[PDB]
Structures are given as structure tokens and as C-alpha cells.
């Protein structure tokens, strides 16, 4: 099964860590918890942002251009990316925008963090059609000393 995991500001705005105004160590912990020991598929800008492989996960980078780092697996198409994951219970797609758009129709699960922040940006999480999904988990947290904004973890499953 294929899942997407993303952090969304108001109006579904998303972006690279350097672009976004929030600091949410609790969300990073949520991301790690839900991706550890699973393959992760990301686009090239997301790879450039993390700077090194995510530990404890098979790192697969989807790009039309040749790889430039032999520490990770490079693929040129959605089908190649899925094949590179082999036989696993769950594949985690970790963005960014174009990658989310390419995998959404194949996905059966979404892990979303809804952040209470208004952010200017051109990149958005794809319009998922809410009535096609069932909300199976929701957990709200206020901002605190460590976390800059309030946020809500949600898991949705495709009907």
C-alpha cells in the first residue's frame, strides 16, 4: 500500500523547511515515527533539503536526471520508484508538491499535519477530495515552548 505524509499550512500550502515559518520538533518526531523502517520516495528538491539519507529507511529519489549521490537509490518514473521499494506492507511518499500529485491517485492512506500558520507560497498539497476519504485518527496540540504553532495530526484512509 502507498501512503503520503505531509505538513500543510492554511490553504494546503507546503514547502521546503527553509521556506516555512514553523519549527515543530513534535511534527518531526511524528514524521520519523510513521516513516521509520519503511521505504521513502522523495523528489530531488526534498533530497537537496535533507542533505543526507534519512536513517533507518530505504531512500528513493525520483528525478528525470541522473543521480548525483550513490548513498541513495535514484529512479526516473513512478513505476520504477514503486518497483525499487520491493515487497513491503507500506511505501511512504514524502513529497514535495509534484511527487505528491503523482502518487496521490495510487495512495490509500494520508498522514497529514495541519499547521495553524498562514504562509505565502506557490506550492500546495494536491486537492484531495474529502468525501473519498475517512478520517481515522485526529490529535490536536497547542503551541508550546518547543513548538512554534498549533498543529493537528490526522490520518485518512481511502474509502
Amino acid at each position, epitope marked *: 500500500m502507498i501512503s503520503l505524509i505531509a505538513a500543510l499550512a492554511v490553504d494546503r500550502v507546503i514547502g521546503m*523547511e527553509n521556506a516555512m515559518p514553523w519549527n515543530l520538533p513534535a511534527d518531526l518526531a511524528w514524521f520519523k515515527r510513521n516513516t521509520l523502517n519503511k521505504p521513502v520516495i522523495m523528489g530531488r528538491h526534498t533530497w537537496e533539503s535533507i542533505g543526507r539519507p534519512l536513517p533507518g529507511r530505504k531512500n528513493i529519489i525520483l528525478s528525470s536526471q541522473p543521480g548525483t549521490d550513490d548513498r541513495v537509490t535514484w529512479v526516473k518514473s513512478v513505476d520504477e520508484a514503486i518497483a525499487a521499494c520491493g515487497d513491503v506492507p507500506e511505501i511512504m511518499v514524502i513529497g514535495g508538491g509534484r511527487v505528491y500529485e503523482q502518487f496521490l491517485p495510487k495512495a490509500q492512506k494520508l498522514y497529514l499535519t495541519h499547521i495553524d500558520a498562514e504562509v505565502e507560497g506557490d506550492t500546495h498539497f494536491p486537492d484531495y477530495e474529502p468525501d473519498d476519504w475517512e478520517s481515522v485518527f485526529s490529535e490536536f496540540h497547542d503551541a508550546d515552548a518547543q513548538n512554534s504553532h498549533s498543529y493537528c495530526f490526522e490520518i485518512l484512509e481511502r474509502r
Partner: nanobody
Amino acid sequence: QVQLQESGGGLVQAGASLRLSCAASERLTVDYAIGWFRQAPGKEREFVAAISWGGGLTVYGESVEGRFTISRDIAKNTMNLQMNVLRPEDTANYYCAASRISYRVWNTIPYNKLTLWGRGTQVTVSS
């Protein structure tokens, strides 16, 4: 490429302050971070401070936390490092860098993974 141009280095006494500046020749995009590393004679280069260009969020090396403050101005396309309560062991060549690597990772990333560098500015702190 975009050039990183450093200024502000000099010689001051222990306990004084000094302000370094790094101006990028072309406007940075929101996905970049910009920051400082330093290298003292005979020592390995080490991380000092970084700020995300879009978010304006900061991180510091353990040896300068509390004493140094990094900031950036979007309009002037410049970043500044205000260095206070300087110590002799802060003496080094200071280098500005920029990269798409998340600012949060700069305290542990190998410095050569950053692809944009200034040429270095000398800071000397004497007792």
C-alpha cells in the same frame, strides 16, 4: 553563480563585539539557508550559525550560542552576524555559505556539501 561577499572582519580586544556581514550578489530564493563557518589555524572548519532565507529561523554552534545573533534582511539581500563577548578562541577565518540544505542540518553537515562559499574574513580577538 551568486557571489557571497563578506565584510566586517577585524581585530578587537577580548570582551568586545564585532558585526560580520554577507551580501549575496543575486536575490536568494526562499528555499535557501545562509550562514557562517569558521576555521582557526591548525583546526578543522566548524559551524557557527545559520538562518533560513524564507522562514528566518536560526540555529547556532554550541560554542557561540547565547553570544552571537544571526539575522537577515530580505530587501537588502544581506545577512549579518552580531558577535558579542568575544574570546581569544573566537579568532579564525570566518566564511559565509549558502545552500538548499535545511538550516537545521548545518550543525552536522560536512561543510563541502554546501556549494556556495565566500572567500573568508579574518577575525582576531586579542587579550
